[PDB]
Design a binder for this molecule. Structure first.
Ligand SMILES: NC(=O)c1ccc[n+]([C@@H]2O[C@H](COP(=O)([O-])OP(=O)(O)OC[C@H]3O[C@@H](n4cnc5c(N)ncnc54)[C@H](OP(=O)(O)O)[C@@H]3O)[C@@H](O)[C@H]2O)c1
Ligand SMILES: CCc1nc(N)nc(N)c1OCCCOc1ccccc1CCC(=O)O
Length: 155
């Protein structure tokens, strides 16, 4: 029932130092069009990784998963388990993806062809296996020259 969206190095990395280690104007655009008008479900560290200007993300119901129910998240709902929201998007991070993967039938992935080598402590995308039906988009080039591609997985 759950559906997930993320961007990742082609090496598997979604986050380093509690932020994303690249800027990609096209992926920001696509993520925004996929989630706008829908609840967005995220974990506590993704919440505080947001740039202040976009905390909470505009035009969407923001839901933060945390162990502390009295946690302060101004302008977001706080919950203590993964919610069963009918139109939510699971937007990260690495812990929340691992929890959700088993209960997921859809994955919308951005891939980034970047010099990024795994480091102790990185946040990593889930491993998608031969149980998924894959739809692979062609490689594209961003203004900066960084090359990326959109992929779809369904179950
Ligand atoms: N590139 C992308 O597409 C993408 C997308 C999303 C995030 N990110 C990156 O991912 C990194 C952060 O991800 P992360 O894995 O470190 O953090 P996270 O998964 O977003 O949040 C982890 C926190 O969620 C809470 N939590 C986890 N499981 C819970 C449960 N079962 N019940 C209640 N609360 C629970 C805990 O916070 P408490 O300590 O409050 O309990 C836990 O420490 C950052 O670098 C961010 O930029 C990247
Ligand atoms: C944008 C990175 C990103 N890209 C994809 N494909 N999926 C995600 N779940 C994701 O993470 C969403 C959470 C991080 O959101 C941001 C991080 C930095 C700047 C702006 C935004 C989102 C801004 C907005 O949606 O209005």
């Amino acid at each position: 029932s759950m559906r997930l969206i993320w961007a990742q190095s082609t090496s598997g990395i979604i986050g380093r130092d509690n932020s994303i280690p690249w800027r990609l104007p096209e992926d920001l655009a696509r993520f925004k069009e996929m989630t706008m008008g829908h609840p967005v479900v995220m974990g506590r560290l993704t919440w505080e990784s947001l740039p202040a200007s976009v905390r909470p993300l505009p035009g969407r119901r923001n839901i933060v998963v945390t162990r502390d129910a009295d946690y302060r998240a101004e302008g977001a709902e706080v919950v203590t388990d993964l919610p069963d929201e009918p139109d939510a998007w699971v937007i990260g991070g690495a812990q929340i993806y691992a929890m959700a993967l088993a209960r997921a039938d859809r994955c919308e992935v951005t891939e980034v062809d970047i010099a990024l080598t795994p480091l102790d402590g990185d946040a990593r995308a889930p491993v998608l296996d031969d149980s998924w039906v894959a739809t692979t988009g062609e490689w594209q080039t961003s203004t900066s020259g960084l090359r990326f591609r959109f992929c779809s997985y369904r179950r």
